[PDB]
Amino acid sequence: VLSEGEWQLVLHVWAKVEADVAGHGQDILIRLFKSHPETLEKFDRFKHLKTEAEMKASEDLKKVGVTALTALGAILKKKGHHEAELKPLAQSXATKHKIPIKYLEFISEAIIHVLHSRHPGDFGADAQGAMNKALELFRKDIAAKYKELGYQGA
Ligand code: HEM
């Protein structure tokens, strides 16, 4: 759905994410919670984590962020051919954690913010646009799968 060059921009900056997945995952979750604190209500085990320091010191939080970014990394590496990887995640999101699509918009914003804050030399305008399209496609395809399951995502 993207150009091949756009996918290389997405996977180039993703290679920089992979140099430190746990750190990126902490930054991305903490950014999400800062910008949209209503998202923290979905994480029953992280409600007692009151400061950014406490969140960064939580191996639980750190593990969740690695799982979530590993899943996204696997999907991004498919270059759009991700229906097999996306269905189980849609099933989990839709019928277990109950994540509205807007929350995936929020965490997509967090991802764009953290990656540009850490790798501006690897994440200019063209690369942000590529990743934005990639995350858009992830979100749209997952929302289709939500409907398929009988949840509309809001
Ligand atoms: C790029 C977007 C996201 C990806 C790829 C992702 C992926 C994952 C994966 C793979 C898991 C563990 C497996 C599973 O539960 O099926 C997980 C767990 C979870 N996700 Fe995410 N997720 C994303 C965004 C979000 C958002 C925005 C929220 C809520 C605001 C959320 C809430 C949760 C919760 C509560 C869990 C359970 C954590 C635990 O193990 O205790 N996720 N996510």
Side-chain angles (χ1 to χ4, degrees), residues 119-149:
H119 321 286
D122 299 297
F123 205 52
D126 290 353
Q128 298 165 24
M131 179 66 81
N132 249 310
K133 279 178 75 177
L135 301 176
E136 261 164 44
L137 180 71
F138 160 74
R139 287 195 308 269
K140 175 149 205 47
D141 284 354
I142 213 163
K145 288 267 160 123
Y146 277 23
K147 288 158 171 285
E148 224 165 63
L149 302 165

mmCIF file of all heavy atoms in Angstrom, residues 119-149:
data_model
loop_
_atom_site.group_PDB
_atom_site.id
_atom_site.type_symbol
_atom_site.label_atom_id
_atom_site.label_comp_id
_atom_site.label_asym_id
_atom_site.label_seq_id
_atom_site.Cartn_x
_atom_site.Cartn_y
_atom_site.Cartn_z
ATOM 1 N N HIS A 119 15.502 9.991 17.146
ATOM 2 C CA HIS A 119 16.258 9.787 15.921
ATOM 3 C C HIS A 119 15.912 10.832 14.870
ATOM 4 O O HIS A 119 15.592 10.465 13.732
ATOM 5 C CB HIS A 119 15.995 8.390 15.344
ATOM 6 C CG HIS A 119 15.877 7.311 16.378
ATOM 7 N ND1 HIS A 119 16.965 6.804 17.055
ATOM 8 C CD2 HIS A 119 14.797 6.639 16.842
ATOM 9 C CE1 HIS A 119 16.561 5.868 17.897
ATOM 10 N NE2 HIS A 119 15.250 5.746 17.786
ATOM 11 N N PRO A 120 16.006 12.132 15.184
ATOM 12 C CA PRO A 120 15.617 13.139 14.185
ATOM 13 C C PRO A 120 16.411 13.027 12.898
ATOM 14 O O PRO A 120 15.854 13.236 11.815
ATOM 15 C CB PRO A 120 15.868 14.469 14.907
ATOM 16 C CG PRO A 120 16.850 14.161 15.954
ATOM 17 C CD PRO A 120 16.601 12.747 16.381
ATOM 18 N N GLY A 121 17.689 12.657 12.978
ATOM 19 C CA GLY A 121 18.472 12.415 11.778
ATOM 20 C C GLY A 121 18.046 11.200 10.981
ATOM 21 O O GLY A 121 18.476 11.049 9.829
ATOM 22 N N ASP A 122 17.217 10.333 11.560
ATOM 23 C CA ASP A 122 16.730 9.149 10.871
ATOM 24 C C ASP A 122 15.226 9.191 10.675
ATOM 25 O O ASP A 122 14.625 8.176 10.302
ATOM 26 C CB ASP A 122 17.119 7.880 11.642
ATOM 27 C CG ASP A 122 18.617 7.714 11.778
ATOM 28 O OD1 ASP A 122 19.310 7.574 10.746
ATOM 29 O OD2 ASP A 122 19.105 7.736 12.928
ATOM 30 N N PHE A 123 14.603 10.333 10.928
ATOM 31 C CA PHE A 123 13.159 10.413 10.987
ATOM 32 C C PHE A 123 12.722 11.825 10.610
ATOM 33 O O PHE A 123 12.083 12.534 11.378
ATOM 34 C CB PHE A 123 12.677 10.021 12.382
ATOM 35 C CG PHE A 123 11.263 9.497 12.429
ATOM 36 C CD1 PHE A 123 10.863 8.467 11.598
ATOM 37 C CD2 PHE A 123 10.352 10.009 13.336
ATOM 38 C CE1 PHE A 123 9.582 7.974 11.659
ATOM 39 C CE2 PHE A 123 9.061 9.502 13.404
ATOM 40 C CZ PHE A 123 8.681 8.496 12.557
ATOM 41 N N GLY A 124 13.068 12.246 9.396
ATOM 42 C CA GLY A 124 12.594 13.503 8.865
ATOM 43 C C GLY A 124 11.158 13.413 8.379
ATOM 44 O O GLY A 124 10.422 12.467 8.661
ATOM 45 N N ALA A 125 10.768 14.431 7.610
ATOM 46 C CA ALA A 125 9.381 14.559 7.162
ATOM 47 C C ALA A 125 8.939 13.363 6.330
ATOM 48 O O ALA A 125 7.831 12.858 6.505
ATOM 49 C CB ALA A 125 9.207 15.856 6.363
ATOM 50 N N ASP A 126 9.769 12.927 5.387
ATOM 51 C CA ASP A 126 9.401 11.798 4.540
ATOM 52 C C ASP A 126 9.203 10.531 5.364
ATOM 53 O O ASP A 126 8.274 9.755 5.111
ATOM 54 C CB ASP A 126 10.473 11.579 3.476
ATOM 55 C CG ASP A 126 10.497 12.681 2.433
ATOM 56 O OD1 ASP A 126 9.590 13.537 2.465
ATOM 57 O OD2 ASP A 126 11.420 12.685 1.585
ATOM 58 N N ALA A 127 10.068 10.310 6.356
ATOM 59 C CA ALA A 127 10.001 9.097 7.156
ATOM 60 C C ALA A 127 8.819 9.132 8.107
ATOM 61 O O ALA A 127 8.132 8.119 8.287
ATOM 62 C CB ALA A 127 11.311 8.908 7.926
ATOM 63 N N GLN A 128 8.566 10.285 8.728
ATOM 64 C CA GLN A 128 7.358 10.433 9.532
ATOM 65 C C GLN A 128 6.115 10.140 8.712
ATOM 66 O O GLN A 128 5.209 9.438 9.173
ATOM 67 C CB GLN A 128 7.277 11.837 10.120
ATOM 68 C CG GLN A 128 8.402 12.177 11.059
ATOM 69 C CD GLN A 128 8.484 13.654 11.337
ATOM 70 O OE1 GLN A 128 7.492 14.380 11.217
ATOM 71 N NE2 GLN A 128 9.666 14.118 11.688
ATOM 72 N N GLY A 129 6.046 10.678 7.497
ATOM 73 C CA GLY A 129 4.896 10.405 6.650
ATOM 74 C C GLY A 129 4.758 8.933 6.312
ATOM 75 O O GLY A 129 3.652 8.388 6.315
ATOM 76 N N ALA A 130 5.880 8.270 6.014
ATOM 77 C CA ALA A 130 5.857 6.839 5.746
ATOM 78 C C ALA A 130 5.325 6.070 6.949
ATOM 79 O O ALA A 130 4.394 5.265 6.827
ATOM 80 C CB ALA A 130 7.257 6.365 5.371
ATOM 81 N N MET A 131 5.904 6.314 8.124
ATOM 82 C CA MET A 131 5.473 5.621 9.333
ATOM 83 C C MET A 131 4.023 5.930 9.665
ATOM 84 O O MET A 131 3.289 5.059 10.151
ATOM 85 C CB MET A 131 6.398 6.015 10.486
ATOM 86 C CG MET A 131 6.060 5.387 11.812
ATOM 87 S SD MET A 131 6.317 3.609 11.760
ATOM 88 C CE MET A 131 8.077 3.536 12.011
ATOM 89 N N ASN A 132 3.602 7.165 9.416
ATOM 90 C CA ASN A 132 2.214 7.558 9.622
ATOM 91 C C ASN A 132 1.276 6.741 8.760
ATOM 92 O O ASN A 132 0.208 6.326 9.218
ATOM 93 C CB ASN A 132 2.041 9.039 9.295
ATOM 94 C CG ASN A 132 1.760 9.868 10.514
ATOM 95 O OD1 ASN A 132 0.875 9.538 11.309
ATOM 96 N ND2 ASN A 132 2.513 10.954 10.679
ATOM 97 N N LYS A 133 1.643 6.554 7.492
ATOM 98 C CA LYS A 133 0.863 5.727 6.591
ATOM 99 C C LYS A 133 0.875 4.280 7.049
ATOM 100 O O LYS A 133 -0.167 3.613 7.053
ATOM 101 C CB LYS A 133 1.415 5.847 5.169
ATOM 102 C CG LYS A 133 0.958 7.086 4.403
ATOM 103 C CD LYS A 133 1.590 7.162 2.990
ATOM 104 C CE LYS A 133 0.944 6.156 2.011
ATOM 105 N NZ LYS A 133 1.511 6.268 0.610
ATOM 106 N N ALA A 134 2.051 3.774 7.435
ATOM 107 C CA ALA A 134 2.135 2.419 7.957
ATOM 108 C C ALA A 134 1.226 2.246 9.163
ATOM 109 O O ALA A 134 0.472 1.278 9.243
ATOM 110 C CB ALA A 134 3.583 2.075 8.312
ATOM 111 N N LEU A 135 1.268 3.182 10.113
ATOM 112 C CA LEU A 135 0.426 3.003 11.287
ATOM 113 C C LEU A 135 -1.044 3.182 10.925
ATOM 114 O O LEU A 135 -1.901 2.492 11.474
ATOM 115 C CB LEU A 135 0.840 3.946 12.410
ATOM 116 C CG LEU A 135 2.299 3.802 12.922
ATOM 117 C CD1 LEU A 135 2.632 4.863 13.970
ATOM 118 C CD2 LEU A 135 2.554 2.434 13.490
ATOM 119 N N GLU A 136 -1.345 4.090 9.991
ATOM 120 C CA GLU A 136 -2.700 4.220 9.473
ATOM 121 C C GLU A 136 -3.211 2.894 8.946
ATOM 122 O O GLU A 136 -4.336 2.486 9.244
ATOM 123 C CB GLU A 136 -2.741 5.249 8.346
ATOM 124 C CG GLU A 136 -3.226 6.634 8.730
ATOM 125 C CD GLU A 136 -2.867 7.689 7.673
ATOM 126 O OE1 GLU A 136 -3.049 7.404 6.463
ATOM 127 O OE2 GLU A 136 -2.394 8.790 8.053
ATOM 128 N N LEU A 137 -2.408 2.232 8.110
ATOM 129 C CA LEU A 137 -2.814 0.965 7.509
ATOM 130 C C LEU A 137 -3.025 -0.110 8.567
ATOM 131 O O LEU A 137 -3.983 -0.895 8.502
ATOM 132 C CB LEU A 137 -1.759 0.520 6.498
ATOM 133 C CG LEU A 137 -2.049 -0.798 5.781
ATOM 134 C CD1 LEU A 137 -3.203 -0.622 4.805
ATOM 135 C CD2 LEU A 137 -0.809 -1.313 5.068
ATOM 136 N N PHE A 138 -2.127 -0.166 9.543
ATOM 137 C CA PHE A 138 -2.318 -1.063 10.673
ATOM 138 C C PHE A 138 -3.657 -0.788 11.350
ATOM 139 O O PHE A 138 -4.436 -1.705 11.622
ATOM 140 C CB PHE A 138 -1.133 -0.886 11.636
ATOM 141 C CG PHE A 138 -1.397 -1.371 13.025
ATOM 142 C CD1 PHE A 138 -1.432 -2.728 13.303
ATOM 143 C CD2 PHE A 138 -1.613 -0.471 14.057
ATOM 144 C CE1 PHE A 138 -1.676 -3.189 14.599
ATOM 145 C CE2 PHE A 138 -1.867 -0.915 15.353
ATOM 146 C CZ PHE A 138 -1.899 -2.275 15.625
ATOM 147 N N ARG A 139 -3.966 0.487 11.579
ATOM 148 C CA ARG A 139 -5.186 0.823 12.301
ATOM 149 C C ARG A 139 -6.417 0.489 11.478
ATOM 150 O O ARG A 139 -7.389 -0.069 12.003
ATOM 151 C CB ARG A 139 -5.183 2.305 12.684
ATOM 152 C CG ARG A 139 -4.220 2.669 13.813
ATOM 153 C CD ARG A 139 -4.545 4.056 14.358
ATOM 154 N NE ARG A 139 -4.610 5.048 13.292
ATOM 155 C CZ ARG A 139 -3.586 5.780 12.867
ATOM 156 N NH1 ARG A 139 -2.383 5.636 13.410
ATOM 157 N NH2 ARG A 139 -3.767 6.662 11.888
ATOM 158 N N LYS A 140 -6.399 0.818 10.188
ATOM 159 C CA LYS A 140 -7.573 0.558 9.356
ATOM 160 C C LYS A 140 -7.841 -0.942 9.233
ATOM 161 O O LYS A 140 -8.981 -1.398 9.389
ATOM 162 C CB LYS A 140 -7.389 1.204 7.982
ATOM 163 C CG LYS A 140 -8.515 0.867 7.010
ATOM 164 C CD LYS A 140 -8.779 1.980 5.998
ATOM 165 C CE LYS A 140 -10.222 1.918 5.492
ATOM 166 N NZ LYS A 140 -11.190 1.758 6.621
ATOM 167 N N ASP A 141 -6.796 -1.729 8.963
ATOM 168 C CA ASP A 141 -6.971 -3.170 8.833
ATOM 169 C C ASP A 141 -7.427 -3.794 10.148
ATOM 170 O O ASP A 141 -8.268 -4.698 10.158
ATOM 171 C CB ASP A 141 -5.676 -3.806 8.348
ATOM 172 C CG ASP A 141 -5.428 -3.583 6.874
ATOM 173 O OD1 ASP A 141 -6.311 -3.029 6.189
ATOM 174 O OD2 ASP A 141 -4.340 -3.962 6.395
ATOM 175 N N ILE A 142 -6.911 -3.309 11.275
ATOM 176 C CA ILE A 142 -7.365 -3.854 12.547
ATOM 177 C C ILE A 142 -8.832 -3.495 12.789
ATOM 178 O O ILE A 142 -9.602 -4.327 13.269
ATOM 179 C CB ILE A 142 -6.445 -3.402 13.698
ATOM 180 C CG1 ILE A 142 -6.365 -4.497 14.757
ATOM 181 C CG2 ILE A 142 -6.950 -2.157 14.402
ATOM 182 C CD1 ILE A 142 -5.222 -4.339 15.706
ATOM 183 N N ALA A 143 -9.255 -2.280 12.413
ATOM 184 C CA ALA A 143 -10.649 -1.886 12.622
ATOM 185 C C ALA A 143 -11.598 -2.725 11.777
ATOM 186 O O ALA A 143 -12.720 -3.023 12.204
ATOM 187 C CB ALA A 143 -10.832 -0.399 12.307
ATOM 188 N N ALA A 144 -11.186 -3.084 10.565
ATOM 189 C CA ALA A 144 -11.953 -4.060 9.800
ATOM 190 C C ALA A 144 -12.105 -5.361 10.586
ATOM 191 O O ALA A 144 -13.211 -5.901 10.718
ATOM 192 C CB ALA A 144 -11.279 -4.310 8.450
ATOM 193 N N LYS A 145 -11.009 -5.861 11.151
ATOM 194 C CA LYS A 145 -11.098 -7.112 11.884
ATOM 195 C C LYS A 145 -11.959 -6.969 13.128
ATOM 196 O O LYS A 145 -12.620 -7.932 13.527
ATOM 197 C CB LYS A 145 -9.695 -7.603 12.248
ATOM 198 C CG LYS A 145 -8.901 -8.132 11.070
ATOM 199 C CD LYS A 145 -9.069 -9.639 10.925
ATOM 200 C CE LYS A 145 -8.708 -10.117 9.521
ATOM 201 N NZ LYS A 145 -7.638 -11.172 9.525
ATOM 202 N N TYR A 146 -11.956 -5.795 13.769
ATOM 203 C CA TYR A 146 -12.853 -5.590 14.899
ATOM 204 C C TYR A 146 -14.295 -5.817 14.469
ATOM 205 O O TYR A 146 -15.056 -6.516 15.145
ATOM 206 C CB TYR A 146 -12.729 -4.172 15.451
ATOM 207 C CG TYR A 146 -11.630 -3.830 16.432
ATOM 208 C CD1 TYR A 146 -10.454 -4.573 16.535
ATOM 209 C CD2 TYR A 146 -11.753 -2.696 17.212
ATOM 210 C CE1 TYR A 146 -9.456 -4.191 17.426
ATOM 211 C CE2 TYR A 146 -10.789 -2.323 18.090
ATOM 212 C CZ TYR A 146 -9.640 -3.053 18.197
ATOM 213 O OH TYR A 146 -8.699 -2.594 19.096
ATOM 214 N N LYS A 147 -14.699 -5.172 13.374
ATOM 215 C CA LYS A 147 -16.077 -5.289 12.904
ATOM 216 C C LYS A 147 -16.405 -6.737 12.601
ATOM 217 O O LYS A 147 -17.464 -7.242 12.990
ATOM 218 C CB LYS A 147 -16.290 -4.428 11.662
ATOM 219 C CG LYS A 147 -16.313 -2.933 11.922
ATOM 220 C CD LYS A 147 -15.977 -2.172 10.656
ATOM 221 C CE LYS A 147 -16.199 -0.678 10.843
ATOM 222 N NZ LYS A 147 -17.653 -0.357 10.836
ATOM 223 N N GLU A 148 -15.488 -7.421 11.907
ATOM 224 C CA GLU A 148 -15.643 -8.842 11.626
ATOM 225 C C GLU A 148 -15.993 -9.619 12.886
ATOM 226 O O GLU A 148 -16.789 -10.563 12.841
ATOM 227 C CB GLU A 148 -14.359 -9.384 11.006
ATOM 228 C CG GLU A 148 -14.530 -10.296 9.824
ATOM 229 C CD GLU A 148 -13.226 -10.480 9.057
ATOM 230 O OE1 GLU A 148 -12.261 -11.022 9.646
ATOM 231 O OE2 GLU A 148 -13.167 -10.068 7.875
ATOM 232 N N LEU A 149 -15.428 -9.220 14.024
ATOM 233 C CA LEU A 149 -15.686 -9.860 15.306
ATOM 234 C C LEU A 149 -16.929 -9.333 16.010
ATOM 235 O O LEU A 149 -17.328 -9.903 17.030
ATOM 236 C CB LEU A 149 -14.475 -9.684 16.229
ATOM 237 C CG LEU A 149 -13.170 -10.246 15.667
ATOM 238 C CD1 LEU A 149 -11.954 -9.735 16.431
ATOM 239 C CD2 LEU A 149 -13.198 -11.759 15.661
#
